[model samples]
Target chain A: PSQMEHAMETMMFTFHKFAGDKGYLTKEDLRVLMEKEFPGFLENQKDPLAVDKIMKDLDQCRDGKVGFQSFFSLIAGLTIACNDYFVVHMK
Target chain B: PSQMEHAMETMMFTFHKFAGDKGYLTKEDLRVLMEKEFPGFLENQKDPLAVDKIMKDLDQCRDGKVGFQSFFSLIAGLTIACNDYFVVHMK
Candidate 1:
């Protein structure tokens, strides 16, 4: 598989790894995922409600749970933001 | 970095890897990317205009070019679809 293919698999399996049997991530799960996978993101956020804000954005259905699509949306949004930063500062 | 972080970095860099000096992917560039990184995707699409259809979907700006965010959207959509399939058939 290509690196991109492996990356896609990682994205899918990572969610299942974190979500576990429930097949969805709760607020606490999201917090842990963010803390572990994206440590700098939460640390850079001075706002205490950062996770809640992000959860609200991802939980568009207001179910208080984030499914795979929502999880992918979070990744998409973050990657886009990072891409923008890279283009401006790093490029 | 976590596997998820590496995946995100792959998503970002993959675009630039193909986009090269253009900073965006032309239709042919997108086609080459899909063919190389996502080989099965285009093959599974029996439609002769598959690339054109995808370009139309991604090129929301109608600029005949796909930027990083749009490229990420393609990955997001495919990953979400793959996740859904995995959940249903492989779970």
Candidate 2:
């Protein structure tokens, strides 16, 4: 995908590896870690919630579970939002 | 005194803090950590040995030890060597 998408994928893979056997973190765990570790960015953002909503909306496959592919696409969408925010704010 | 000296001091402070209770790392410990953690860069370098020699050479105080100031100055000298090497190699 795009460079931002690649970065997001790499970040997620690193987080997943660190959280071994847990597979996916609970929403609360994600919120806590983001608030503590990433403070000003991604903490308490409605954007991640919107991502969760989008994943749920797109998971039409059997079992209704969002896999890595779905998660990766959700990250790609978030990257677009971030890029737009930076362009408008930084420029 | 200079940006390079500042970076070296910061690096040394970080290393010292990380190696607590031991004050200064034994030469052997420094070599092992560089080889394992930094590889290809600091590891297997004759330069670091030259640095140890310089520290011993400059410990003129009756204490016969190189404290932080002397250690930092030695780093400043090493940095000059590094800059010259990079200028010649990268050019």
Clash counts per candidate, in order, are 0, 0
lDDT of 1 by residue, B13-84 (tens): 889999999799999899778767864345333354567888999999898989988888788766665555
Residues A1-91 of candidate 2: C-alpha lDDT, one tens digit per residue: 5998997677777557534576654444443443344332331122434324543554656344445555556455545654554454335
Model 1's chain B TM-score?
A: 0.92
Q: Give lDDT tens digits, candidate 2, residues B1-82.
A: 7998997676777557635666654444443443343333232122434325544565665344445555556445545654
Distance (Å) between predicted and true CA of B58, model 1?
1.2
- Separate DockQ for every predicted complex: 0.02, 0.01
The interface RMSD for candidate 2 is: 22.3
Model 2's DockQ?
Answer: 0.01
- Model 2 residue runs over 4 Å out of place are A1-9, A22-52, A62-64, B1-91
Best by TM-score: 1
TM-scores for every predicted model: 0.49, 0.30
